[PDB]
Amino acid sequence: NAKDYQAGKNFTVIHSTVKQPPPLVEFFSFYCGPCYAFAERINVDTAIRKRLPDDMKLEKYHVSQMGPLGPALTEAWAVAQYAGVDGKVEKLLFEGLQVKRDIKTAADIVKVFNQLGITSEKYAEMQSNFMVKALIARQDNLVEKMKVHGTPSFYVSGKYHINNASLAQDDYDTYAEDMANLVLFLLNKPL
C-alpha cells in the first residue's frame, strides 16, 4: 500500500544553516513552464494541500534571480499573499507570462491587480508594507541558503529535496498523488 520512498532515488538529504526553515516550501518562477503545470495542469499543488494538516500550508517562494521581472514578481507574490488574493492572481501571472506574454514590465503586473479591485495606489501602499518587505527578503534569502538550482523545487523540513522525475509516470493524476504521498512520507520522518 504505502510506498517506502528511498533516499537518493526519490529525494536527497540537503544541508541548510537556516534556523527555522518552512516545513514545506516549493521554489518556483512564474516564467517556468513546469511551475505553471504544477499549479494549473498537473495540479501537484492542490494534491499536496488536500493532504496536509490544518496547522501547515504549502509555502510558495518565488525566485527573484530568474528573468527580467523576477524581482517585480517576488514583490507581486508577497503583496498577493498580504492582500490574500494569492489564490486568484497566481494563474493570471502564469498566463500573463506564458500564455498571453503581455506582462513585459512591472507596470503590467500592477494591471493584473487592478482587474481584481486593487488600485495602483493601494498596490504602491502594499509595496511599502513592513510584512510585504519581510516576505520578499525571506524568499530571496532562502533561495540562497537552501541553494536552490531549479524550479519547481520542493523542500521538506529544510533537509529533504524531492526528486520530481522519480515519481509515478503513468499519468499526471497519479503523479500528483505520488508527490503528495512522498511529501507526507518526508513530513512524517524522524527528527
From TrEMBL:
InterPro entries referenced in this protein's UniProt entry, alphabetically: DSBA-like_thioredoxin_dom, DsbA/DsbL, Thiol_disulfide_DsbA, Thioredoxin-like_sf, Thioredoxin_CS
A GO CC term attached to the entry: periplasmic space
Gene3D superfamilies, per database record: Glutaredoxin (3.40.30.10)
Localization, UniProt: Periplasm
Cross-referenced Pfam families: DSBA
Keyword field contains Signal: yes
Positions of disulphide bridges: C32-C35
Molecular function per GO: oxidoreductase activity
UniProt domain DSBA-like thioredoxin: residue ranges: 24-177
UniProt KW Disulfide bond keyword: yes
Keywords from the UniProt entry: Disulfide bond, Periplasm, Redox-active center, Signal
Alphabetical list of PANTHER family matching this protein: THIOL:DISULFIDE INTERCHANGE PROTEIN DSBA (PTHR35891)
Entry's family note: Belongs to the thioredoxin family. DsbA subfamily.
Name by which UniProt lists this protein: Thiol:disulfide interchange protein
Organism of derivation: Klebsiella pneumoniae
Lineage: Bacteria, Pseudomonadati, Pseudomonadota, Gammaproteobacteria, Enterobacterales
